[PDB]
Amino acid sequence: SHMYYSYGNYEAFARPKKPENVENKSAYLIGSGLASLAAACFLIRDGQMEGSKIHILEELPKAGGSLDGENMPLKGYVVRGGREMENHFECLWDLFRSIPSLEIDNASVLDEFYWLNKEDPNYSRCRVIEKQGQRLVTDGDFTLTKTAIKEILDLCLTNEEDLDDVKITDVFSDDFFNSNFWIYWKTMFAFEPWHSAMEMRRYLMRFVHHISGLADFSALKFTKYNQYESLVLPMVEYLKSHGVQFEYDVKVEDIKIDVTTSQKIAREILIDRNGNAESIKLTINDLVFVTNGSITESSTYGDNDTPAPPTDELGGSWTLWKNLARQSPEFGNPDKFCQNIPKKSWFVSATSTTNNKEIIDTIESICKRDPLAGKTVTGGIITINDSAWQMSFTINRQQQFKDQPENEISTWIYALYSDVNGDYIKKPITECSGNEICQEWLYHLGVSTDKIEDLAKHASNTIPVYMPYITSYFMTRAIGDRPLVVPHQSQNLAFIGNFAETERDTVFTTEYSVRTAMEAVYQLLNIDRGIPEVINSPFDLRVLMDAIYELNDHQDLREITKDSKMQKLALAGFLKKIKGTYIESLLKEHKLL
Amino acid sequence: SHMYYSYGNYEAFARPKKPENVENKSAYLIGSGLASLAAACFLIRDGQMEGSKIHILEELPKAGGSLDGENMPLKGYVVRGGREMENHFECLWDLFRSIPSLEIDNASVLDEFYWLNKEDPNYSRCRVIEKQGQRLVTDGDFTLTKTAIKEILDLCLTNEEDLDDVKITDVFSDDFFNSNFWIYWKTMFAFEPWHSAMEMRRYLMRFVHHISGLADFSALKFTKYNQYESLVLPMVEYLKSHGVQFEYDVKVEDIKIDVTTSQKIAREILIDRNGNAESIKLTINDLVFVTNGSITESSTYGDNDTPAPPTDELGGSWTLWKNLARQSPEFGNPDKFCQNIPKKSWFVSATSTTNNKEIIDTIESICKRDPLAGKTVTGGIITINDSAWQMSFTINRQQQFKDQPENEISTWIYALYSDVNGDYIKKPITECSGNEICQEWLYHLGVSTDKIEDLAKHASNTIPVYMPYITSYFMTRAIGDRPLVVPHQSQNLAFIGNFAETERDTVFTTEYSVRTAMEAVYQLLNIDRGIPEVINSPFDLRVLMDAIYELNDHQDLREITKDSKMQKLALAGFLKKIKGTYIESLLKEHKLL
Ligand SMILES: Cc1cc2nc3c(=O)[nH]c(=O)nc-3n(C[C@H](O)[C@H](O)[C@H](O)COP(=O)(O)OP(=O)(O)OC[C@H]3O[C@@H](n4cnc5c(N)ncnc54)[C@H](O)[C@@H]3O)c2cc1C
Ligand SMILES: Cc1cc2nc3c(=O)[nH]c(=O)nc-3n(C[C@H](O)[C@H](O)[C@H](O)COP(=O)(O)OP(=O)(O)OC[C@H]3O[C@@H](n4cnc5c(N)ncnc54)[C@H](O)[C@@H]3O)c2cc1C
């Protein structure tokens, strides 16, 4: 193609030559989420494109998209969701080592993040609770049977090309869905049983190097504040310092694209700049980066006394992608992702803010840390295993908002099941006000029922959010439902974000938006530098040995095959062949012998 | 330990916090070769130690050590040797992305190197010649038998701990030593048959990712000029710009070190600053970095009419290490490396400089490129397979010296066998003047015998070098013959360079001197940043598949087991199990099916 994949320090530390003819080129980016902001950064840093020639078109009043986090007027503090990150976000760390921190002088976002997560390393002291505040007895074990582990491996051993439209329930049976592994997995990643087995396979291979840090979240890393303040604003400042044009309340309705037998060229961007319909006409030297689709599109907000009103509106993002899909099948199949979403699916998240000491003290007694100490609190989500909603909640380092009073915590809450009565509040989450969500949560923390209503109604402000498309990334798909980052024969059109198509990597991650942004800029501008591949961990023998050990809850190879002689016989035969060799040493080194 | 290994961009791009109490610390570095210069750079950049507190002590009049390259007065142009490098010199590229280029403004040594090797990618058009100038018929094939390949794998499958004092001839039989593979291997890496099987195993695993670029040198990368001008001088300028003290003609005779039951502390450096004997007394906050041993120590130089005089002098480097070994067995076993070196071993290298058109035209006719064009010429060494000396020669990009006339080439020549009469000059190389080495070389290029003596004597200036210890890295060794980079309980003493002990990596490489330098600085100062591991290629399934394909001269798995039914039966059984799975896809992707 117009790019190549690499790994290692040589390509990481190298600077690309200024790409050819970039002086006569411009860039239009549809949306101002993380993908578009990352594409613009690469355009500045590695494309050496003029800032004033880069135009970011956003339909909302501000930037960031799904990376939001704000004190919403007449409502309260809101996080549409948190962001778990990890060391092997290979592209995203390439980007943010070049973004100046807004807190620490002469340091980058990576530096401040790197130091913070060493000062205050993330881990969970309590991962799963049940029976109104009691820690799950087996918390920390995966409780996978040998049958469940085999299905996990059969899935990874399945070609991606054979998982078209296959569901997670099509490839796993009873034992797996009964495991603690599935509890940790489905909740930390927001998988539903009807979601894409293809994506879940991508996930099993993508984070295999962190399976030992799965139950305790010790592989997770977190920014200092919410992702708007810690990621979006550093990017915007950097971009603004280079003269990049930001255009808000501009809704891209369509892009007219010539798809001939030899070329795809974007010709005109049909926009609605606040009520009025206008156009931007393009040449071949005007590059268009489309964030196609969005999980946060058409979001509604409730308040402490009002449910967030459910909706099925196709907003601008999904109507744009549909209008583009009308012009070539190579531009993807939006309806696979925005249509026929089950009403059981996750729709609602809520931010519960309180300074009340009974609430805060109850959270301390479950998570074993002071929620107001300024460090890790829950270390990630706590899952209420036996909750009807399949609800989970987390308290990040407090306060997640620079402007927030230092005696308040904000708790983020979400529910995997949206069409089921709660256990204390006898309604589905979609039917619930802020305070009713809070009440159902407080009940599962063991708060005395005598106090739940008053603590929720009067000692807390809880803002709910209804997101019709929050599960849209994971909908069952076929190869081809997502456009290439640079479709075949495209001259000036790229698709970026978590609905574009690239190899191996996992969607529902910020890394995917930076990778697609990076690959699009590199291909359209023919930048002469490698793109870091998705980390090679599933091909690494040492990581595969570790995974066998971890998946079998820390049993060596003799314990594993202990009670099946057909496999035990082969082990003895295997050990005869490898005794006194380097394979026996590696296996011992990774606790398999 | 006081360090950890990592890989990936997160650790690569991160900056370490200023280490604790570094303000009250100093550094003494014994030698000014690449290791010491690299240790000082890391001390400046990542240790944030004051430059004026860093003291580099060198016995020679200038810096660089084995990285030399100069117009030696009354002699001629000399390169003690070239430097093949590769992309996965993980530590060295970490270092040199921080070293400013002396040619390109606002660019680093890595940048200029990275760009140059893309502008002018290295490859050989002619790797092995014989019969006075004819290309080897099988050049490009490895001509390994299945028996030779099995021995290669049995070696890698042997624990390092079981190769103590084992020779290369102890683990390989006839077929291997008859292969083209061994021709390429022994000459590009300067292995002798009596050298350490342990190191050769380390080499097989270390560069397994480049086995496809072995015969044509397409994996090699080269600096613009000789390594003194392109590597040493950029470092010195950087170091000097930070106030580092350089001390020349200072010979370190001994370091007094307290080795107690609980600590090793260096107390005093006994020096000879030009004739006079002096001392430097140390506290625990004075760090000492010892480059122990040297392959270039005690080098003698001839000229066009005089042999370089053979020697067996222990110079300052080997006497220093012996004096240190007298103080603890934990400081290594110098005699394994500087004593009992076979007289057949490589001792002599020579730089032949000429502007003569018959010589230059003859080289063009073998290497197929214009030697004076300013780009790649031989792409690496050309090996004269049927030469009694087992001689090889290379012409790098010309001119290798910024000051050299643009109508001259310099050819670097070396011989693996030092005690055998040449085929045209009937003497061992050690007995030969500059011009006699040149004459023997010219004969193997097909130069008409009528012209050889005059072209060598009068149309060329050839400077020979006698290096008693040039093969010293590869001498058979046991675990323990080399000190840890930071010996157990050392407080202020580290050993650096290619005679120190670290995991997996290969000596006779510049990467090893930067890695040992990096690890020593990081351990003694407790720098809070990862050290990049030796590249994980021998654990990568995809690289192991490629190696099977390449080692079997590009045969798939059916061709390989074609004529052994005991293995063919197992293949059929293997293929039954994996058909329609992702393993079958990977194998096809890597040409094994
Ligand atoms: C609740 C939640 C939790 C998450 N947790 C994690 C996590 O733990 N770890 C992780 O790695 N990732 C997480 N993510 C994912 C990450 O936040 C998203 O993947 C990422 O922000 C996607 O960014 P994007 O730029 O690709 O698109 P989006 O974030 O969806 O942004 C699209 C933007 O474009 C604008 N736009 C859309 N259509 C149009 C149009 N037609 N015209 C003009 N403008 C338009 C929108 O206004 C929006 O600003 C989470 C996301 C959510 C919602
Ligand atoms: C001919 C040749 C070809 C090579 N080719 C390659 C190649 O292709 N690729 C590759 O990666 N590497 C190659 N190398 C290796 C690389 O050049 C060396 O590994 C590297 O330079 C070692 O540096 P060092 O600092 O570890 O020690 P040295 O280079 O040996 O330097 C030691 C220095 O310390 C000084 N010193 C020694 N003892 C004392 C003392 N007692 N007191 C004071 N000062 C002292 C010496 O004067 C010298 O300057 C080659 C080396 C040679 C000789």
Numbering used by the authors:
A (entry chain C), B (entry chain C): -1 to 591
What did the study's authors say about this model?
Flavin adenine dinucleotide (FAD)-dependent bacterial oleate hydratases (OhyAs) catalyze the addition of water to isolated fatty acid carbon–carbon double bonds. Staphylococcus aureus uses OhyA to counteract the host innate immune response by inactivating antimicrobial unsaturated fatty acids. In this study, we deduced the catalytic mechanism of OhyA from multiple structures of S. aureus OhyA in binary and ternary complexes with combinations of ligands along with biochemical analyses of relevant mutants. We conclude that OhyA accelerates acid-catalyzed alkene hydration by positioning the fatty acid double bond to attack the active site hydronium ion, followed by the addition of water to the transient carbocation intermediate.
